Amino acid sequence: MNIFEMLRIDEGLRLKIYKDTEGYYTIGIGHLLTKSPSLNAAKCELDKAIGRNTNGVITKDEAEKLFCQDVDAAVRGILRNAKLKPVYDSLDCVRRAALINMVFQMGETGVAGFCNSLRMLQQKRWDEAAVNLAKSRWYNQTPNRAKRVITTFRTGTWDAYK
């Protein structure tokens, strides 16, 4: 069990363009295509991201390649961010996955704005971090996923993904 398996559980897999929980055109394993309401714009982004004329449908291999790149981009966003890197560096491998999961879902800037939660995580105040992380739009809008990620921070185990 690892960051790829964890996000595959949380994001699912769709080979045709769908809308994410915010209503944004998405494909694959949670690959955001655009925030524009135009499905044509989403199709351009898809074709640009895949390197061929897709007409809104990709293969599982293409979805997994986007997923590889997206996980890498989440880690890169963490490592380049002055607020996120010290937290990441302080965490064990399982909790690092939980932080990557948040960045994959919400982006570097959004997660870097959890300033109190980030301090509690760095100080290994797990129960207090868990309570603070739930005081968020994130928890309220996607509570089942947030609960799994928070449980991962609270326990340092994969128990919520079993």
Which residues belong to the active site?
A: 11, 20
Positions 8 through 27 that interact with Na ion (CB under 5 A): 19
Positions 116 through 155 that interact with Cl ion (CB under 5 A): 142, 144-145
DSSP for the chain?
--HHHHHHHHH--EEEEEE-TTS-EEEETTEEEESSS-HHHHHHHHHHHHTS--TTB--HHHHHHHHHHHHHHHHHHHHT-TTHHHHHHHS-HHHHHHHHHHHHHH-HHHHHT-HHHHHHHHTT-HHHHHHHHTSSHHHHHSHHHHHHHHHHHHHSSSGGG-
Residue 19 binds which entry of Cl ion, Na ion, none, CB below 5-8 Å type-dependent: Na ion
CB of 147 to Na ion, least distance (A): 20
Residue 142 binds which entry of Cl ion, Na ion, none, CB below 5-8 Å type-dependent: Cl ion
Residues that contact Cl ion, how many (by CB under 5 A): 3
Which residue's beta carbon is nearest to the bound Na ion? 19
Binding site for Cl ion (CB under 5 A): 142, 144-145
Binding site for Na ion (CB under 5 A): 19
